Amino acid sequence: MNKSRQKELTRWLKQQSVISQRWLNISRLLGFVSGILIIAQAWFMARILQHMIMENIPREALLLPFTLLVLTFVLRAWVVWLRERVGYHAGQHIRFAIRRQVLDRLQQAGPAWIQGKPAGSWATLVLEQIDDMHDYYARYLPQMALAVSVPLLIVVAIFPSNWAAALILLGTAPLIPLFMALVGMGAADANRRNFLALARLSGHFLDRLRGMETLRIFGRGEAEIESIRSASEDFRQRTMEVLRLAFLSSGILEFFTSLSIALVAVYFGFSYLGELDFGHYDTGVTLAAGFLALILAPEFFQPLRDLGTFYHAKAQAVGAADSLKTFMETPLAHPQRGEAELASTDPVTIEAEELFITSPEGKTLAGPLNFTLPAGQRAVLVGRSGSGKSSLLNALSGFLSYQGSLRINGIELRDLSPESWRKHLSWVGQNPQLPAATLRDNVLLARPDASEQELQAALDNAWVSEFLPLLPQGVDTPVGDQAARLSVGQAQRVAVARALLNPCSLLLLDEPAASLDAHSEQRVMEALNAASLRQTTLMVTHQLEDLADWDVIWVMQDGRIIEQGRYAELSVAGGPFATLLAHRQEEI
Amino acid sequence: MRALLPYLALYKRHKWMLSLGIVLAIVTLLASIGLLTLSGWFLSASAVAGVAGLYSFNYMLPAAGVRGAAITRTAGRYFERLVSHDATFRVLQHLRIYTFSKLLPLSPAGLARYRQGELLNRVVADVDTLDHLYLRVISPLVGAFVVIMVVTIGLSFLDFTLAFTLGGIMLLTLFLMPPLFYRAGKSTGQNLTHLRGQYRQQLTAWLQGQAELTIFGASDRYRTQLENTEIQWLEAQRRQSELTALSQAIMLLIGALAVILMLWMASGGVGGNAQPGALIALFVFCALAAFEALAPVTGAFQHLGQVIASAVRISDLTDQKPEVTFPDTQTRVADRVSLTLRDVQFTYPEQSQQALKGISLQVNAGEHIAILGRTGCGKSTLLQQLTRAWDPQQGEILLNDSPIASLNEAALRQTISVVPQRVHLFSATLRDNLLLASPGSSDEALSEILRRVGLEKLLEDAGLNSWLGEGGRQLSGGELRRLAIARALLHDAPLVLLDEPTEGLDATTESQILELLAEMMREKTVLMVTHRLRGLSRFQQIIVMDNGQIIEQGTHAELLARQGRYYQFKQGL
């Protein structure tokens, strides 16, 4: 169902075509010229053949019609080559423009919205589904213009010569869709009966191929071969009932293609003998008129035959449009961008009043947040999972929009220009990524032109140089799941080295040295505890011990900072921090 | 084209069905040529005869010919698509049983170097591409070659110099144009696959690391690099469409040259006589109609390049040697299993860092051990050694004081029952999602286990016939976890390996699942791997792992009594 939706998707497809309307017009125009040259080359053969067969004109006297016939063939090949290129350039132009709009939306939304879906899900929308629209604009749209302009030209061209030959071709014009509809009625019932099972059998091979580990640990590998064998005979038997009615509908066009050529031959052949005396205009029927109709009889149905082979390109573009439309119409409130610039590189002062951290979809992630972190002072956020600690850090990063007030040195964060604000910002978060190609390009992500001495001092400080020999190519070894996998603690020291390379104003540590082994946790917290004293710092940790030195502790519960104070004061005084500190730890 | 041989032996089966589909492609395509050739000659013969000579001219035979040739190209085309597609689905069964059979012996280890998310999607696509070799390459190419020969032989009766100058032109462009275009598009097709997966690799890095790039001022720099790959990628797509344009324009120019030559050469004379008359149109309309045979040949170079790429890609995946090999000793499954490890060391095939570093532990019969470690400590790599997914490089593993490498795969799978960290819910019914654990269990045996592990809502309103999977009912993480434990209960193996069984669960169901562990498999050697601390007092000999080696080992009381990582874990120091 949802026809009102499928009509809106096709409505969306034609909106994107305005990007290259110029090339859709040329293809539309070149398909009219392509049908003029089909008639011209059928007219020159019809006139040449009449002279040789009936008038016995020698070929040497027919040089002028031959020359125009060769030219019409050369021109007809040029238009075919030109239409393929114009059609591709049209379709590629939508894909380039749309992919830029998709990535602009993803960059504008930022990591807050990207992290909702897997990166594989985003790759499908950008690569697979944007490419699925190409054949709609490259092949289907030009062909539908060709499927109407060409067959109407043959009918118009044959009609002056003979109105019965043109009526044979035009007679099939309303009969083909009428019979396809009748077959589509029968094919609909068979399609609906086999739809549930075929879609169920479609993913059978991939589901036995995924979870092939489970078939191994249970010794069911051989018993699943008979399962794949049985699901392949069931799929075939169901999909041939669909095809028995689909190739019948596809053969309606091929039935009238031959019935037209058979009738053109029989009518003209009997007209020349005197059996029939009705079709012509009582001027007599010539051999050229029969050749013109016979050469153009298969060309009448060729545009409609190609449209059948390009019709799949419309269904796969509507599905692509379906998902690409929802992506581009989501409300998606995003953080506000200003143009103010921070005055100095000195540590900043953070202060909030009735702050409300808002998700891209508008949901509040942290309730009214009231706090004040003086310049150069390090704070720590503690709380149970889901409290909203990372949401506060993300808002300071500019990744989330806030309703209340959040001032950096008295300047609102929304006023601050993101490009200049992130220059005063550094961070080490949970599940940190290494986007760059190599281990060197990751540490130097903040400043790629830093010299060897600057780079060596950064690796040594973060204790990256101690595990470098274990890697094959030293600093230059590519890092990733596909190349030289790093341990969780080794990749965390690369994130620490990257964050400490540049002097910052505010450093945001989100669960650093969590899920690290003992040695890396000591080394990560060695470098980060030293770096939290050079600027204002905000750390999020589930480890409540050894917080005595930190200037202030904030305890968050359900998006609310409920208890603020030093470690010494909060420990003795009963409260939410005392409960957290005495609470049993569920997992490592 | 040497890579197609392993998969062309799968086409050997159902050849009489593949050959019938090609035969119907000749008959359909000769009727198309015959209908236009006879019609062109019938028009010329009737016009030359004229009204004077109506009775002399035999017009019922050609009129019966055009009627017969019209029926046998619509019926012929219908059965050509039916037999061709039926024979294609028969082979697809062979291509998927073959692919699955070669991927089982190397399922955990042969596929580990890749991203299983987008590798198995590629394996399914490559099997489909290999399945369309006959439809897209063999049938259009073999079908056109036989049609050209029949036309050339048929026209040779009328004139030898005209039959071989039309058949020769058609046979030249069948035999040297596809090789020339495949050769020209070989580099672009490879550049196009390299640049597509490079763009995907660069886009995933740019999207996953968007928080790192945005704050360290690299997001614009890394998007220009991403958009430069797209420009190269689109340039390769344009060069691939220039060959599609050039191949269609050359087929049109060759088919034009055949028409021109027939008009010029057959005008001089067809056979012995000059002024051939009607026979001029028989050759012109044969050249005009016989290039429908070569129309599917035009794109066959593009399809053949894809199938060869898929054949190489599948072959490189299924032809690697299995990591582990099982002796066919045919031993009996032991009633009680005691597990022993000594200096087990393991490094992954390409990594230069050890995943397990001298792990040696002992698990006695009927003993419940719990391996306790952080993320990435190598505890899932330890259980994969017990299921023999890999082989330790410098250690020994013993089941009941006998090496684990001396057990036949059928005995190994019956000795060890493992609940994986990632539970797989197969597309089949709830009954078939449990019968893999124990095929012979009755429908009442499956019903009580579901009621014994707390899955009683699954038996509602459909029973065991509920379809769970891609199109069916999905199971929640806690409801999926009890199914993994339900499978282990049905297997009834002496040794049970649970990888993070209570992982991502609320404390209400975590406690009862862990309670379910202790009461059910109480007489079984249980080795649980987990990063949580709940219910560890029940287990004896808690083992703490860190960075691939054991750092602390003892029961719940002793580990707390002496200050250590477990005491730090509990305290949260």
Ligand SMILES: Nc1ncnc2c1ncn2[C@@H]1O[C@H](COP(=O)(O)OP(=O)(O)NP(=O)(O)O)[C@@H](O)[C@H]1O
């Ligand atoms: N972008 C988002 N869209 C929707 N919900 C979100 C988003 N970010 C966070 N949440 C949810 O909002 C609540 C608070 O999230 P968050 O503030 O990130 O937790 P946290 O304190 O970092 N949790 P944890 O680190 O595991 O202890 C949870 O329900 C989150 O899953």
Ligand SMILES: Nc1ncnc2c1ncn2[C@@H]1O[C@H](COP(=O)(O)OP(=O)(O)NP(=O)(O)O)[C@@H](O)[C@H]1O
């Ligand atoms: N296929 C692989 N190739 C190379 N290294 C791998 C592979 N699989 C895992 N590793 C690495 O092996 C180490 C141990 O991983 P693993 O045994 O999965 O730990 P774990 O304790 O099971 N982790 P977790 O699942 O998060 O609880 C880590 O460095 C992994 O990244």
Ligand SMILES: [Mg+2]
């Ligand atoms: Mg968090």
Ligand SMILES: [Mg+2]
């Ligand atoms: Mg694991």
